[PDB]
């Protein structure tokens, strides 16, 4: 260790560098979606036209039916007429097309992530140089260097930012980035984590086929979007304001769910195959999984909690709601996102959490959790994994 | 604790200034290390013959002579591969330069990665000596293929870990992931009381194997270095006396993207598999910046000479070892563990550096050294890869009984 013009000559057993004291907290949230808006009502027309499937009326009627019951009003896509016409392979069913899909995704994911991040950083109000870690997830393509570095570069973060990139995880990654951010923020004094999820449909988009019904469901639900969250423990008075506190983060693989959802990255892009009743498996096991955690804070009723659930589709929301006998308004934030954005994979649940904060603000509620002190952020996906975080919502001033 | 359980909504430890679930007290420690490699042994001396035969490139004698010179100076004596003549003959597309073959490669890698990871994990668990049910988290990385569900769940199932194990899967990261899984394990272990993390790196070459090309020399070099292998480390804070024994303590984990290193290393996952492009002198960039990156940490621990520390450096070829060694003026013994691994296994991507750390421990034991760091108290574990990212962990080696 140098001192002035001379020198002097650390922690044997104990830790050389200190950890934080308080629980990790959500300090800000931001989001972004591409410019092209596609109304669900007439999406079948565009879809069957661009994929040259107009001579398949029965299949189109099937897709229209799926779209009509999707609970989705509109979706945002980077993909448009021009891009798809310039990439005919992507408009076929299974023709070799990974290279053109990767070219699109590798560029769009970090771009959308940067916008969501800037929105979060703007609400946060602190210099981007204070960001010490970046944690990111996407199921839209893979590259080396990863999308997290591409994003950090677009944002102009410090060269020594600690990174965690989690590619190809699926619909439960929204909860995953927060679980990872929680430990990074809590175990490092002063740490401020930028947690991101960015998804684009370039890798999954493909022509409809009666030989791939699962593909029909995906083409009706998946949309584009990115969300960013600033996470940190020990908020500084005056310049930072906690919205939620993270107190528990866990997950589990559901019994008898092997093969429920398989995702294969192939020469033709990403293809999903479903084998079991996902909504059923989740509904049957969700209660037992959550019970233990609720008990940690003495919560007895499901309705005393607020919910930020991944809007995988209308079926999962309806069945869980019924199973837990929740008041109609408990899942409204989730339904609001499904309606305005569709299923944006991992970023969806983050959009839902921001919406919970939004509804609390506009409805003059006593907390950021629409009036409830404790709540669950839930994500689910492949392996039939259910991820969950127990959040405590901070007080919100009322009129 | 329930504290009687009469007022659970108020007696729990969760508040704006306290936590519901306790974190650990001490630094995360390496409690055990295990490794595994596939059965097929390919001698480097004659790899060129096999390679040019299987890729049908015998009509390129000049390119072969060039490959032979690369293999002869690679610092590698042998490598272990899952791939063999039979498998490659059953997958002709993989024996070409750039013909569509991703689906062939994916089928092979998806099954092999978790299998090798399971073997490595079982060895680490066996050394640790505790019930596998005590594993609370699994952190894994691989650059060999991608699947949904991921390799970490596939590995957890093969191992029979608890259904609620917390997972972190990091696909397609590259050669620095060995340090990465440890940096992640460090935070998970230290922030959760009782947590025991299984950190894994498993790599197979099915996705990168391909025919040599006169237009892709950096690619030819890769074909001489990449081998298969998996390593697993059990990480946990507050070791339990009598049933656990700390080998190394982790005290710092950092990383940085080197200046002027854009495009230094690009890895593209294509219809023809994973293709690497090295546009800059990798060892040069690392050698030029490594000193300044570690300087402050080195001074923090009270070391004035780089020789006062032990080392576990990713053996990404012989040049990085030679150049950094010269730059930091290290005695030949400092990088010997790294050279031993390069010699016996080649470059196993992310798992390599973990093999090296295990080797440092082994050399300490066989040489009657005073610590698990071959006599030194502090040391650096270093990995590097794409985005010219350098990852490093500061480790403290525990004392070792001497005869
Ligand atoms: Ni002084």
State both tokens at B198: 């299984």
Residues B217 and B366 in one domain: no
Note whether B290 and B324 are within 8 A (CB).
yes
Q: Which residue of B has its CA nearest to A387?
A: B166
Number of other residues whose CB lies within 10 A of the CB of residue A239: 10
Residues A237 and A285 in one domain: no
- B192 chain-A contacts, CB cut-off 8 A: 183
Interface check A255 vs B, CB under 8 A: yes
Phi, psi of B231 (to 5 degrees): -140, 150
Strand partners, B235: B30, B197
Note whether B351 and B143 are within 8 A (CB).
no
Domain edge (last residue) among A220, A242, A264: A242
Residues A250 and A191 in one domain: no
Cα of first residue to Cα of last residue in chain B, in angstroms, is 46
Alpha-carbon span A171 to B113, nearest angstrom: 23
Residues B308 and B218 in one domain: no
Angstroms from A83 CA to nearest CA on chain B: 20
State both tokens at A255: 């019994």
Residues B197 and B75 in one domain: yes
Nearest to B394 by CA among B30, B129, B16, B5: B30
Residues B227 and B251 in one domain: no
Helices (H), A125-172: 147-155
Alpha-carbon span A352 to B166, nearest angstrom: 23
State both tokens at B168: 């972190």
State both tokens at B110: 């998806």
**Domain residues for A384?**
243-399
Alpha-carbon span A111 to A117, nearest angstrom: 10
Q: Degrees (nearest 5) of the Cα angle A238, A242, A245?
A: 150
- Scored b (16 or more CB within 10 A) or e, A366-379 reads ebbbbbbbbbbbbb
CA count, 13 A, side-chain hemisphere, B155: 34
Contacts of A377 (CB under 8 A, 6+ apart): A174, A175, A178, A308, A309, A349, A352, A353, A388, A389, A391
Note whether B119 and B36 are within 8 A (CB).
yes
Helices (H), B84-190: 85-89, 102-128, 151-159, 177-190
Angstroms from A55 CA to nearest CA on chain B: 30
DSSP string, A217-278: HHHHHB--EEEEEEEESSPPTTT---SEEEEEEEEEEPTT-TTSEEEEEETTEEEEEE-S-H
Residue from the list A143, A159, A251 with its beta carbon closest to the beta carbon of B257: A159
Q: Degrees (nearest 5) of the Cα angle A244, A246, A251?
A: 130
Alpha-carbon span B384 to B353, nearest angstrom: 10
Domain edge (last residue) among A204, A221, A242: A242
Residues A279 and A135 in one domain: no
Residues B99 and B10 in one domain: yes
Residues A276 and A298 in one domain: yes
- Scored b (16 or more CB within 10 A) or e, A251-287 reads bbbbeebeebbbbbbebbbbbbeeeeebbebbbbbbe
DSSP string, A52-90: T-TT-HHHHHHHHHHHHTS--SEEEES--HHHHHT-GGG
Nearest to A331 by CA among A346, A350, A310, A351: A310
Note whether B159 and B120 are within 8 A (CB).
no
Strand partners, B249: B29, B396
Tokens 């460090």 appear where?
B186
Alpha-carbon span A308 to A293, nearest angstrom: 16
Cα B12 to chain centroid, rounded: 40
Cβ of A16 within 8 Å of Cβ of B251? The answer is: yes
Alpha-carbon span A113 to B231, nearest angstrom: 33
- B386 chain-A contacts, CB cut-off 8 A: 144-146, 149
Residues B223 and B311 in one domain: no
> A358 vs A312, A370, A399, CA distance in Å?
21, 9, 16
Nearest to A221 by CA among A46, A66, A104: A66
Alpha-carbon span B212 to A210, nearest angstrom: 42
Residues A67 and A91 in one domain: yes
State both tokens at B108: 């092979």
DSSP string, A288-357: HHHHHHHHHTT---GGGSEEEE--S-HHHHHHHHHHTT--GGGGHHHHHHHHHH-B-GGGHHHHHHHHHH
Contacts of A245 (CB under 8 A, 6+ apart): A22, A23, A24, A25, A26, A391, A392, A394, B14, B16
Q: Is the peptide bond before A271 cis (omega within 30 degrees of 0)?
A: no
**Resolution to 1 decimal place, in Å:** 1.9
Number of other residues whose CB lies within 10 A of the CB of residue B69: 12
SS3 assignment for B284-346: HHHHHHHHHHHHHHHHHCCCCCHHHCEEEECCCCHHHHHHHHHHCCCCHHHHHHHHHHHHHHC
Alpha-carbon span A273 to A292, nearest angstrom: 32
Interface check A188 vs B, CB under 8 A: yes
* Number of domains into which chain A is organized: 2
Cβ of A164 within 8 Å of Cβ of B167? The answer is: no
Alpha-carbon span A145 to A134, nearest angstrom: 14
> A278 vs A14, A271, A317, CA distance in Å?
47, 17, 12
Q: Which helix (H) or strand (E) holds A181?
A: helix A173-186
Domain edge (last residue) among A179, A213, A242: A242
Nearest to B252 by CA among B294, B196, B210: B294
Residues A136 and A271 in one domain: no
Cα of first residue to Cα of last residue in chain A, in angstroms, is 56
The domain that contains A285 carries what CATH number? 3.40.47.10
Tokens 């916008």 appear where?
A115
SS3 B401: coil
Sign for the CA dihedral angle at A163, B316, B172, B280 comes to positive
């Amino acid at each position: 260790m140098k001192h002035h013009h001379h020198h002097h000559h650390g922690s044997s057993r104990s830790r050389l560098i200190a950890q934080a004291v308080g629980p990790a907290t959500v300090l800000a949230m931001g989001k972004a979606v591409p410019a092209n808006v596609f109304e669900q009502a007439t999406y079948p027309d565009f879809f069957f036209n661009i994929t040259n499937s107009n001579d398949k009326p029965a299949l189109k009627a099937k897709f229209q039916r799926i779209c009509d019951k999707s609970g989705i009003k509109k979706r945002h896509f980077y993909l448009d007429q021009k891009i798809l016409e310039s990439n005919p392979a992507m408009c076929t069913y299974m023709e070799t097309s990974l290279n053109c899909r990767q070219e699109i995704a590798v560029a769009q994911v970090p771009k959308l992530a940067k916008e969501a991040s800037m929105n979060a950083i703007k609400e946060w109000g602190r210099p981007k140089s204070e960001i010490t870690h970046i944690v990111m997830a996407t199921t839209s393509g893979v590259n080396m260097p990863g999308a997290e570095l591409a994003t950090a570069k677009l944002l102009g973060l410090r060269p020594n930012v600690r990174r965690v990139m989690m590619y190809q995880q699926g619909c439960f990654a929204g909860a995953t980035v927060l679980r990872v951010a929680k430990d990074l923020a809590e175990n490092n004094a002063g740490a401020r984590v930028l947690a991101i999820c960015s998804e684009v449909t370039a890798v999954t988009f493909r022509a409809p086929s009666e030989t791939h019904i699962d593909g029909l469901v995906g083409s009706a639900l998946f949309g584009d979007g990115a969300a960013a969250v600033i996470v940190g423990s020990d908020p500084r008075p005056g310049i930072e304001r906690p919205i939620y506190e993270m107190h528990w983060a866990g997950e589990m693989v559901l019994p008898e769910s092997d093969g429920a959802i398989d995702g294969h990255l192939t020469e033709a892009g990403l293809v999903f195959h479903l084998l079991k009743d996902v909504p059923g498996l989740i509904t049957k096991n969700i209660g037992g999984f959550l019970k233990d955690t609720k008990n940690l804070v003495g919560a007895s009723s499901w309705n005393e909690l607020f919910w930020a659930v991944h809007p995988g589709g209308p079926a999962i929301l309806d069945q869980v709601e019924a199973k837990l006998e929740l008041e109609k308004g408990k899942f409204q934030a989730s339904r609001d996102i499904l309606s305005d954005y569709g299923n944006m994979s991992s970023a969806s649940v983050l959009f839902v959490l921001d919406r919970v904060r939004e509804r609390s603000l506009e409805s003059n509620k006593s907390t950021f959790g629409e009036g409830s002190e404790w709540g669950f952020l839930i994500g689910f996906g492949p392996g039939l994994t259910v991820e969950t975080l127990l959040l405590r919502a901070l007080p919100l001033q009322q009129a």
